[PDB]
Design a protein around this ligand. Structure first.
Ligand SMILES: [Mg+2]
Lengths: 714, 597, 708
């Protein structure tokens, strides 16, 4: 007998047992599928799809650019980005007609967001291509470095503290004739280095996408951020959209649409559902199309708002794609390896590369400028998802029976990457005609539906973004099982996070009681192993075992000690929500209770409120008692800033004089130094008054404060 | 001392001095987000790796004086080292356990007080009651629900103010020192936490957690109270259910009902008034609900009703673009319609002036006991779907939907006069009168409404005119779902227009809300360091600056210099005239109001 | 900002500001800085004139007639009329510009202004603007500063303090709300200006170059878009584009589908980290010896329980390596074991002396040196890194046998899950029942042995790597177990030697050599072990019906590499358990829903209901709940062990075909457009992996069954 679990799908329907078709529980440990060759393929295919368009020469970067818009009508089923502006405008007009006032209210909310936002928001992004150092760097450090360079280049609008001010600063920068970059050499002796960038060099650096998929520089974060705010505002008001809702709302949306399309169907109407994916989403979304749709959306609006919203597509339409690290060359005769940076790929012979790479380089050479390829048509992932969703929802909404003028009519959702159409018509001829019309209109707008990945079946069953719908039952596997191991904050934080995630999975993720019990057992075992806090009675001979044994031999109510101190686990489906120290507070021994919770212990540390009893993964919040087991683990570890920690050093010593600064964003008009000076003077005076300070300290403090005053005045 | 010497060191360098003198305290938190470090990806792997080391835990210098270098077994507790970026000495978990087993001991008297929320959870569990499990199909309707019981439902700003006064006594902003209402809770907490050595940041966070409200979108199938949500994992399952009851204390307030009654009275008494807008505004500005002005409650409470919505429209704010008709919250979802005025003759020879919507519109209705959808054409009912726990809920929901449709078929199906008049003896609009009439009796309409067969499919069943399930025949476009329908997921708030008649009109010229739609039911109504006025920037003549905590010694009317906010020295005085900032501008307000009109 | 203005000030003043601005044809929703400025202006005006009255004798008083008269809150005609009336009645001179207030006690027009900037500058601007000495000036600042002519401030200290404090609180609230900066900015001298953001210079050219073909300037495009109306553009385009651009539904009915074609080539070879079904363990039933617990002590005690150490010799050569060096590695391991045995002072860990065979085995310094391309650009042999197509292979039956041996039970229990709180709630009791039943079902299965063995291996590896940075550490492969007699048994699968562990990233690899005992003969299936080196290290007596038969005991040595991420993923294999349960419990629960009663006993103890869980020559084979439990557990554990990108690609691209065929089964009349594309996408994922080829065969079998 041979075990063959796939045969199980002869009794248990596929949707019911879908958990078996998902191999991994967590991140697979290889993380492969990216490289410079992939970027070459992407550029070549993007320019291939749009090849039939007009070829132009940009006046600033000198790079060639492609314009497929209003191109000749597609004649074949291959993916084509030859979208028509008139058609997208008509589609947006109909969308506004069927949802009057959506564009206007979205614009008002976006205006509010533009006005109130701040610069520091850009420190909340992911890895970012710092143009100043010409490499990837953290969002916070990249922003600090860009601010430093702008300050050294006489651009300090961002000093006001507003994101739009930083955008105006970038505006000033890109029109500058030359940019000066200063760097320090940190060892042995320290020096200085100055570099000068002409207008074209900096312009190219601003419109670059470092590929590691790609990440733009701080130049093009704010404009896309505001366009994303607008798109999110529009989508929040659309029923057919799929963003930015969570797991629970997706099921409701799916059920609503399916019931609406099925029940309204009469006894003489046939219904079908097309579960579909898009051939190549970001490779056929011309930025000009988004500019046209934003122009339509922001009709009759303040000009500043229109321009702030229009910069992002304008910037993206002339963007540059970087070519990563380069290539690796290996010689077997002398077992000699070398790295060739992609910069010289323009002017290197075509004999070290295989046939496929030779074709790639031959196709990409004419489009290569200063080591970066000019990619006008197409787009990159993770930036214009919401606006693309808006366009998809517009074309879907075009299906209303009034527009079609004929019996057939369609509806459904759209989540950018994938979608699920539903078509109603009298006969199968009607269904065919409706699907044909939908397909042709999507092509005209410039959208290609993956014919291979898209299948059509009578209404009742479908899939949508990993949500499997079968006759009303929706199965969720978008994220699959979470990570039940210790997150790795500290003892108490990890315990609370584990119990809380088990509880949340039980409430929302449809997890079972026995499954929750087993998850708790596994988590407690993992915790005990990781933190060397095995039971005081058990002998496992770890580094910590002796002290735990002494503690156990010392106490009396051994059922009260924490897990991390050698105590029994007392959790269950009953009290997953109860913090540990509380859950066994009553049992705690008086002396152990006093020691464990002594607030003068040197092992407790609290950071700013945003990082107190909260962890970043998305983020989740946990409840725990600040005990001796709340310690913080040790930290592990060409720069424009002379001292990378000057800002962190500065904010510290503010918390000292003003502890409230840690809790709430402090507000005041006086500069900081005078604030510390006044607080210190008052504190020293009152300290002398009490009698715990003598004359010498008072004199020293006042001399020091006076000297600081003189130093700051000058 | 250490702090001032460190500040002097910082000032010595050019760049630190420049950043100190340039940046204003307002933007301090902006330069707190400029971190040059690197966030650790996959911290679980990092923790696993770290725990294997000898000294992976960071302690402070003072530890050198209390915990000896080695224990009895000569193990190394703390090492003469420093962390990367500070002077935090390096210690091992052995140090933590040694501290726990042999460290100095104190009294955790304030720990229950600071941590009342968690201990409240403990008590609620410890006194609960369980019951037999039941296995059956579970329907979990999705909705918003509270999270933390025991909260005062204060706004985040108010919670921040309370925390600042409680734990940061001499660092409170200017608003508190120019404030009058010293909340009772603040004094209660100040008395409770007299001698508390707990880290003040921890105390502040715990008070914030305790005094704030939180709401989440969850699928529930049973009790929705806050104490019934914290045990939702234990109570509801996919195929089972658990009988449970918390055994603590519930804090269900009643201010919402009082606000309902107040708004209803205001609208009822202002609709007949000469100038309802200014009149209602004056009332709302001068009315108190249980010791608090109604304006704060209106701005805070998320109530949804016709009276309160019209009050907001008059005052000027955002309200949901929907109406609660017949006890059901409606919401448009798709299509568009145009409002047209017409005269309709009923089956009782009664002429009514009505306004009907023409268009292929779609609505979703969520009631107290049902959920429904309705697709309506131009004066034509196309499709109706309802789902409800009981048959009576089904019937009332369907009656509401059909009267909303305003089709011509039911017009000839009216039997009896429609002369209903509210308790105020004010003529009711035709649609409400029809709604009440069909509530009284609709059998005749059911017999003459419409009957047609329906194909049989899973998940949905028909209804006969006597309101009984059927699979082979039902009413025109009337159907019932055997599974609960999830409520609306979002609501759209748009700018609306209000006329003097308290009718709210949308930007398209249609009307949204009317006082006539308001139910006429009647219910029952269930060393203070404050009072200081600043006198501009610091003045040297008055003497050296004082700390806020020591302001109490000031004589009546004496003016001194005190440090308010996060280091802002200002000249303040005690009050002499027993007034407040509330009554200012009222006289000039009324004067200019008379002038404009 | 606009919301803040509406909420913070008296609504009537908001109405006055709205009317005053609407007089100028402005909309607050477009401009709010002016709205906030006007609201502040009216508020300060009405504050100034409040609580002031004229007594019977004419002296001022605080609570008749208002000492201050407001002029700023009125229309142009009204304000002009009232100022003219004041001038005539009190004989006052006409100011060149409209004042704000009129003080009756001193009989003078006073203009008042709130400035976001310094007080003095605003005072000078106002004085220069008015150019008259007959109008008093009172300037306030949000910061707490004010100024007036001669410092003759009309009000008393109390009212000045009130106005100062109101403005100060307004400033603090605006700052805390993140609007103070824009408010202070919008003030330009004596007027408030709308926020401006205009495209000039570089972006102007960029926008001119980023428009559709038939447009030349961004302004022309904006004008075209603004004036556009929907007139059958889409209909005309559809009527134009050729019919060949269409989505045709291809019928899918019981005949179209075909099996997936596997790649041709030689049989695929084992690639697991450790031996799975061919391992042998040296056992000690009760480790009650001195210094127990340390892996080295247990390993040595297990070693001493076996005799038959004969001279090893290469049996299955490492086709690429140097077999004698592997032989010398094993000999050194044995010699160090004897040496430490005779030392009598076994420490916690054993560090191996560096040697030629060790350094070569762990790949120490066998790496090409890095050079600049230009320096060696003349080398003829220089060529891009070899990244050609991986060799296609053929599914070999060893994978199926391994899986079949994985889904079967053992003699002892390979899991010791920790404790939980006592059950109180009835659902807690049902959960405990279900959990205990599942645990008993899979507490001894082979997959659980794999889980425990790998967990221990990776835990020891990582701990030694962190503790021993620059040493060669000898790590016995040990496991613990509970025999049918309930005795704590210890098992020794083999040994592992780790190279240099100076690891910094989560993807850089540490190289190790693993030597696992075994009893199989590689020569039977050489292609299985083409990455291993096998030394016949001894002879073992196996008991059978014919007595004790001697068999050759082998020792598979191989060189492998592990990354920190891979070690963590190895230590996470226990989560596999949960996965299995999460697929059965649902089924249980499902039936309960259709039965309205619990079904744990009628499933875990009935042993009558069955599901098709395999294939056999007779037909499809049906299995009980335990069969499915252990089958799913084994599938999860193997997926963990044989994880590869091709696996996930095939799974994702095969789910679609599964759903299509199932929809056909439900009589839903499914259809497709480019099914051949789906088949090609699925087929592209089958190249070399044993696991993926096995799954493809399984899918072919399932399609064959379902089609009939
Ligand atoms: Mg899809």
């Amino acid at each position: 007998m041979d075990v063959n679990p796939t045969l199980l799908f002869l009794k248990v329907p596929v949707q019911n047992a879908i958990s078996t078709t998902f191999p991994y529980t967590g991140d697979p440990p290889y993380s492969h599928g990216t490289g410079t060759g992939y970027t070459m393929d992407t550029v070549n295919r993007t320019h291939k799809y749009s090849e039939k368009g007009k070829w132009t020469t940009n006046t600033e970067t000198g790079a060639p650019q492609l314009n497929p818009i209003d191109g000749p009508l597609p004649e074949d089923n291959e993916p084509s980005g030859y979208a028509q502006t008139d058609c997208v405008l008509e589609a947006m007009a109909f969308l506004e007609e069927s949802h009057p006032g959506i564009f206007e209210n979205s614009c008002l909310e976006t205006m509010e967001i533009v006005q109130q936002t701040r610069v520091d928001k850009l420190t909340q992004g992911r890895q970012t291509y710092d143009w100043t150092l010409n490499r990837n760097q953290p969002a916070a450090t990249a922003l600090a470095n860009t601010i430093e360079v702008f300050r050294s280049n006489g651009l300090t609008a961002n000093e006001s503290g507003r994101l739009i001010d930083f955008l105006k600063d970038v505006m000033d920068s890109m029109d500058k004739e030359e940019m000066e970059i200063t760097t320090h050499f940190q060892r042995r002796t320290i020096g200085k280095k100055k570099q000068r960038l002409n207008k074209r060099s900096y312009l190219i650096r601003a419109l670059t996408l470092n590929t590691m998929i790609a990440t733009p520089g701080m130049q093009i974060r704010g404009f896309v951020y505001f366009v994303e705010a607008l798109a999110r505002s529009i989508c929040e008001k659309l029923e057919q959209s799929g963003l930015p809702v969570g797991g629970n709302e997706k099921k409701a949306k799916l059920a609503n649409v399916v019931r609406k399309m099925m029940t309204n169907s009469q006894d003489t109407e046939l219904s079908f559902t097309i579960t579909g994916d898009n051939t190549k989403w970001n490779e056929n979304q011309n930025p000009r199309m988004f500019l046209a749709m934003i122009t339509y959306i922001t009709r009759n609006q303040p000009e500043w708002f229109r321009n702030v919203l229009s910069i992002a597509p304008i910037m993206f339409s002339n963007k540059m794609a970087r070519l990563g690290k380069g290539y690796m060359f290996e010689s077997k005769s002398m077992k000699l390896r070398t790295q060739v940076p992609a910069e010289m790929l323009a002017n290197i012979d075509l004999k070290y590369f295989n046939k496929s790479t030779r074709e790639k380089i031959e196709k990409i050479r004419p489009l290569l400028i200063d080591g970066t390829a000019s990619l006008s048509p197409g787009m990159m992932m993770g930036m214009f998802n919401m606006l693309s969703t808006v366009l998809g929802v517009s074309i879907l909404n075009l299906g209303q029976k009034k527009y079609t003028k004929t019996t057939y009519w369609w509806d459904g959702l759209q989540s950018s990457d994938d979608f699920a159409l539903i078509v109603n018509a009298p006969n199968h001829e009607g269904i065919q005609a409706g699907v044909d019309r939908f397909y042709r209109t999507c092509k005209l707008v410039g959208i290609n539906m993956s014919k291979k990945k898209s299948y059509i079946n009578r209404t009742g069953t479908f899939e949508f973004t990993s949500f499997f719908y079968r006759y009303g039952f929706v199965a969720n596997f978008s994220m699959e099982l979470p990570s039940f191991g210790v997150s790795g904050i500290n003892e108490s934080a990890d315990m609370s996070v584990g119990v809380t995630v088990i509880k949340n999975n039980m409430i929302n993720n449809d997890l079972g009681p026995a499954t929750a019990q087993m998850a708790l057992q596994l988590f407690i075992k993992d915790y005990r192993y990781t933190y060397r806090c095995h039971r005081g009675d058990t002998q496992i001979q770890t580094r910590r075992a002796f002290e735990l044994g002494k503690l156990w031999e010392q106490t009396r109510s051994k059922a009260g000690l924490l897990v991390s101190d050698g105590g029994p686990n007392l959790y269950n489906i009953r009290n997953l929500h109860i913090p540990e120290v509380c859950l066994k507070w009553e049992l705690m021994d008086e002396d152990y209770q006093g020691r464990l919770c002594n607030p003068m212990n040197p092992f407790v540390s609290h950071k700013e409120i945003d990082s107190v009893n909260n962890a970043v993964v998305k983020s989740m919040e946990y409840d725990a008692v600040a005990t001796t087991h709340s310690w913080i683990p040790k930290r592990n570890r060409r720069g424009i800033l002379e001292d990378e920690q000057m800002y962190q050093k500065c904010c510290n010593l503010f918390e000292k004089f003003f502890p409230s600064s840690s809790y709430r964003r402090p507000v005041g008009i006086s500069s900081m130094v005078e604030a510390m000076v006044s607080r210190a003077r008052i504190d020293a005076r009152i300290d002398f008054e009490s009698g715990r300070i003598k004359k010498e300290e008072f004199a020293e403090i006042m001399k020091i404060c006076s000297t600081i005053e003189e130093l700051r005045r000058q | 001392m250490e702090r001032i010497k460190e500040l002097r060191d910082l000032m010595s360098q050019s760049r630190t001095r420049e950043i100190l003198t340039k940046t204003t305290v307002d933007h301090m938190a902006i330069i707190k987000k400029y971190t040059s470090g690197r966030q650790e990806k996959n911290p679980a792997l990092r923790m696993k790796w770290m725990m294997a080391m000898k000294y992976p835990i960071t302690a402070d210098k003072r530890i050198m004086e209390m915990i000896p270098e080695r224990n009895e077994q000569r193990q190394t507790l703390w090492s003469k080292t420093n962390d990367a970026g500070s002077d935090r000495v390096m210690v091992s978990p052995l140090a933590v356990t040694w501290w726990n087993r042999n460290g100095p001991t104190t009294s955790t008297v304030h720990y229950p007080k600071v941590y009342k929320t968690y201990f409240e959870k403990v008590e609620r569990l410890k006194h609960g009651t369980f019951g037999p499990v039941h296995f059956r199909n579970q329907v979990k309707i999705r909705r918003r629900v509270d999270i933390n019981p025991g909260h005062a439902d204060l706004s985040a700003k108010e919670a921040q103010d309370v925390i600042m006064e409680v734990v940061f006594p001499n660092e409170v902003g200017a608003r508190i020192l120019t404030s009058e209402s010293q909340l009772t809770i603040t004094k209660e907490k100040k008395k409770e936490l007299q001698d508390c050595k707990i880290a003040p940041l921890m105390v502040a966070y715990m008070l914030e957690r305790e005094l704030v409200r939180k709401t989440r979108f969850l699928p529930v199938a049973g009790g929705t109270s806050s104490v019934y949500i914290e045990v939702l994992h234990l109570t509801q399952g996919t195929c089972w259910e658990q009988m449970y009851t918390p055994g603590g204390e519930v804090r269900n307030d009643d201010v919402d009902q009082s606000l309902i009654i107040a708004a209803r009275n205001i609208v009822r008494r202002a609709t007949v008034s000469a100038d309802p807008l200014a009149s209602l505004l004056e009332m709302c500005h001068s009315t108190q609900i249980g010791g608090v002005r109604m304006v704060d409650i209106l701005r805070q409470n998320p109530t949804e009703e016709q009276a309160v919505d019209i009050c907001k429209a008059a005052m000027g704010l955002r309200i949901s673009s929907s109406f609660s008709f017949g006890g059901f919250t409606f919401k448009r979802t798709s299509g568009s319609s145009v409002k047209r005025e017409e005269e309709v003759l009923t089956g009782n020879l009664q002429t009514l002036k009505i306004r009907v919507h023409e268009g292929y519109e779609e609505f979703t209705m969520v009631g107290r006991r049902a959920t429904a959808i309705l697709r309506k054409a131009t004066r034509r009912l196309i499709q109706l779907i309802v789902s409800g726990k009981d048959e009576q809920s089904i019937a009332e929901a369907i009656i509401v939907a059909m009267v909303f449709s305003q089709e011509d078929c039911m017009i000839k199906a009216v039997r009896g006069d429609l002369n209903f008049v509210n308790r105020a003896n004010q003529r009711l609009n035709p649609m409400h009168q029809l709604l009440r009439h069909f509530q009284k009796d609709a059998k005749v309409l059911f017999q003459n409404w419409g009957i047609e067969p329906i194909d049989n499919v899973m998940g949905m069943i028909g209804i006969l005119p006597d309101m009984t399930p059927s699979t082979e025949m039902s009413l025109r476009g009337v159907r019932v779902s055997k599974m609960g329908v999830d409520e609306y997921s979002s609501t759209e708030r748009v700018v609306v227009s209000i006329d003097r008649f308290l009718r709210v009109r949308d930007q398209r010229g249609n009307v949204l809300l009317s006082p006539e739609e308001v139910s006429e039911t009647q219910g029952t109504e269930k060393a203070v360091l404050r009072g200081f006025l600043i006198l501009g920037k610091e003045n040297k003549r008055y003497g050296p600056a004082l700390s806020i905590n020591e302001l109490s010694n000031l004589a009546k009317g004496e003016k001194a210099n005190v440090l308010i906010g996060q280091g802002d020295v200002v000249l303040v005085m005690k009050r002499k005239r027993d007034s407040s900032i509330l009554t200012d501008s009222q006289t000039a307000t009324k004067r200019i109001r008379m002038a404009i009109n | 900002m606009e919301d803040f203005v509406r909420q913070c000030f008296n609504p009537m003043i908001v109405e006055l500001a709205e009317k005053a601005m609407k007089e100028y044809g402005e909309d607050p929703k477009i401009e709010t800085n002016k709205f906030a400025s006007i609201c502040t202006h009216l508020e300060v005006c009405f504050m100034y004139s409040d609580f002031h009255f004229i007594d019977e004798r004419g002296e001022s008083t605080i609570i008749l007639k208002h000492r201050f008269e407001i002029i700023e809150g009125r229309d142009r005609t009204m304000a002009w009329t009232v100022v003219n009336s004041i001038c005539n009645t009190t004989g006052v001179e006409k100011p060149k510009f409209l004042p704000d207030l009129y003080d009756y006690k001193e009989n003078r027009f006073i203009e008042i202004g709130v400035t976001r900037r310094e007080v003095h500058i605003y005072y000078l601007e106002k004085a220069n603007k008015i150019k008259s000495e007959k109008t008093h000036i009172h300037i306030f600042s949000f910061t707490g500063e004010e100024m007036a002519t001669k410092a003759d401030y009309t009000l008393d200290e109390e009212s000045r303090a009130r106005i100062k404090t109101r403005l100060f609180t307004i400033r603090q609230e605006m700052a805390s709300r993140g609007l103070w900066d824009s408010f202070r900015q919008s003030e330009r001298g004596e007027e408030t200006i709308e926020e401006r953001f205009e495209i000039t210079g570089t972006m102007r050219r960029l926008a001119d170059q980023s428009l559709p073909p038939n447009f030349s300037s961004l302004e022309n495009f904006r004008a075209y878009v603004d004036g556009f109306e929907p007139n059958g553009c889409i209909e005309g385009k559809l009527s134009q584009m050729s019919k060949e651009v269409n989505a045709r539904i291809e019928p899918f009915l019981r005949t179209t589908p075909r099996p997936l074609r596997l790649p041709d080539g030689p049989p695929c070879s084992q690639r697991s980290k450790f031996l799975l079904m061919d391992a042998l363990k040296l056992s000690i039933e009760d480790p009650s010896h001195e210094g127990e617990g340390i892996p080295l002590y247990d390993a040595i005690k297990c070693m001493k329980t076996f005799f038959g150490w004969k001279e090893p010799n290469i049996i299955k050569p490492h086709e690429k390596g140097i077999n004698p060096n592997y032989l010398l590695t094993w000999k050194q391991v044995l010699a160090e074991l004897q040496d430490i045995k005779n030392e009598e002072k076994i420490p916690r860990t054993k560090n191996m002396k560096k040697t030629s065979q060790l350094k070569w085995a762990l790949g120490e310094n066998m790496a090409p040196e890095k050079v600049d391309f230009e320096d060696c650009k003349d080398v003829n042999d220089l060529k891009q890194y070899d990244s050609d197509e991986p060799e296609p292979r053929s599914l070999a039956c060893w994978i199926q046998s391994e899986f079949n041996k994985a889904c079967e039970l053992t003699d002892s229990s390979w899991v010791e899950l920790d404790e939980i709180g006592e059950d109180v709630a009835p659902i807690e009791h049902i959960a405990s029942m279900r959990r205990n039943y599942f645990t008993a079902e899979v507490s001894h299965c082979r997959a659980t042995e794999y889980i425990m063995k790998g967990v221990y291996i990776n835990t020891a590896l990582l701990n030694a790597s962190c503790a021993a940075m620059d040493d060669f550490q000898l790590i016995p492969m040990i496991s613990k177990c509970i025999t049918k007699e309930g005795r704590r048994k210890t098992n020794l699968y083999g040994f592992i030697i780790k190279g240099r562990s100076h690891l910094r990233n989560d993807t850089d690899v540490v190289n190790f050599v693993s030597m696992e005992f075994s009893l199989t003969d590689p020569r039977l299936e050489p292609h299985k072990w083409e990455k291993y080196c096998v030394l016949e290290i001894g002879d073992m007596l196996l008991r059978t019906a014919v007595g004790q038969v001697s068999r050759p005991m082998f020792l598979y040595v191989r060189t492998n590499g592990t990354s920190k991420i891979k070690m963590k993923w190895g230590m996470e294999m226990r989560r596999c358990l949960l996965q299995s349960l999460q697929q059965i419990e649902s089924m249980i629960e499902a039936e309960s829903s259709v039965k309205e009663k619990d079904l744990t006993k009628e499933f875990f103890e009935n042993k009558s209901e069955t599901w098709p869980i395999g294939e056999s020559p007779k037909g499809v084979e049906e299995g009980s709940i335990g069969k499915v439990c252990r089958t799913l557990l084994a599938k999860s554990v193997f997926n963990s062990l044989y994880a590869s990108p091709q696996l996930e690609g095939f799974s994702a691209e095969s789910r679609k075909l599964l759903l299509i065929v199932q929809a056909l089964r439900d009589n839903l009349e499914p259809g497709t457009f480019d099914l051949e594309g789906l088949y090609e996408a699925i087929e592209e994922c089958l190249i070399n992996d044993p696991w993926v080829l096995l799954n493809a065969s399984w899918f072919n079998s399932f399609l064959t069954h379902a089609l009939r």
